[PDB]
Design a binder for this molecule. Structure first.
Ligand SMILES: NC(=O)[C@H]1CCCN(C(=O)C2(n3cccn3)CCCC2)C1
Ligand SMILES: [Zn+2]
Length: 140
């Protein structure tokens, strides 16, 4: 689990969104595994606006932050699970790292701020849903 809190927005994995998230919905995209809801209190996270390919992510199943090299946001296959059928997930970045159930929502960050959240695992792979192109998170 985990979320990004920027301005009056809460960014979570779409597959982990609560009823309160859906009842206060700003935007959602199943192809990206992302959902944004509105918040009463202002958050402290800042979004990175960059093309970094190195950063650090939080792994809840290890209670550890790991430095990683990650790929550019792309259209990657995610093998069926109980959340989405076989398909292609967009705006996804992969790294070698550990990711196992209980781990989505962990933040990936670079020197500029938050880059995205854990969206995949298995295989000694970590997938992150990028948020750096969502410029509207910084305003209104
Ligand atoms: N983005 C998605 O489509 C993911 C939704 C949750 C399930 N997905 C995964 O990658 C699995 N996972 C690894 C670490 C955490 N979850 C792989 C093994 C079992 C579940 C796919
Ligand atoms: Zn950066």
């Amino acid at each position: 689990s985990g979320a990004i809190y920027v301005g009056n927005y809460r960014v979570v994995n779409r597959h982990l969104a609560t009823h309160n998230d859906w009842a206060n919905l700003v935007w959602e995209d199943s192809s990206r595994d992302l959902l944004v809801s509105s918040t009463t209190a202002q958050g402290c996270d800042t979004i990175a606006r960059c093309d970094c390919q190195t950063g650090v992510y939080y792994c809840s199943s290890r209670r550890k932050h790991y430095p990683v090299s990650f790929s550019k946001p792309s259209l990657i296959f995610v093998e069926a699970s109980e959340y989405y059928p076989a398909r292609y997930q967009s705006h996804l970045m992969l790294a070698v790292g550990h990711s196992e159930p209980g781990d989505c929502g962990g933040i990936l960050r670079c020197q500029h701020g938050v880059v995205g959240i854990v969206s995949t695992g298995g295989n000694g792979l970590v997938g992150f849903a990028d948020v750096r192109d969502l410029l509207w998170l910084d305003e209104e």
